[PDB]
Design a protein around this ligand. Structure first.
Ligand code: K
Ligand code: K
Ligand code: MG
Ligand code: MG
Length: 133
RNA sequence: ACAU
DNA sequence: CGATGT
């Protein structure tokens, strides 16, 4: 109902889908960019959204921060909850890099704990997520 | 349909 | 318009 301003917001940007994928995380309150992932040559929107959330979890854990994460991605939120990114993207040589990162993100989820709430950014009510590209 |  | 997803 109300924005939790003491939070980290993430978003994916892409050139094509599948296409070049990047993501970033921002302080929801201030818009300060807290992390940005170097563009990945081929990936899907949902893989990027998933990697962004997981990176946020790792970022906040490293800093002993209990802030929640906002994502606007129904899909990625579910994939993180499940610890399983159910992407349809073909695994081939061109998609190897994104799939390695997705596999490693799943692996991290499966070997670490966190209490970070992962919250749906309610775009219909609040406008674009603050990490938007 | 909903979320991108 | 087409693509990624539940
Ligand atoms: K975006
Ligand atoms: K669809
Ligand atoms: Mg998004
Ligand atoms: Mg966006």
């Amino acid at each position: 109902e109300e924005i939790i301003w003491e939070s980290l917001s993430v978003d994916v940007g892409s050139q094509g889908n599948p296409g070049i994928v990047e993501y970033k995380g921002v302080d929801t309150k201030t818009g300060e960019v807290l992390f940005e992932r170097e563009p990945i040559p081929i990936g899907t929107n949902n893989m990027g959204e998933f990697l962004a959330i997981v990176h946020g979890l790792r970022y906040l854990k490293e800093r002993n921060s209990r802030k929640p994460i906002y994502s606007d991605s129904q899909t990625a939120i579910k994939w993180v909850k499940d610890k399983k990114a159910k992407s349809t993207l073909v695994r081939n040589e061109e998609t190897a890099l994104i799939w390695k990162l997705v596999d490693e993100a799943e692996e991290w989820l499966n070997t670490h704990t966190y209490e970070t709430p992962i919250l749906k950014w309610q775009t219909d009510k609040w406008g674009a997520i603050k990490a938007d590209y």
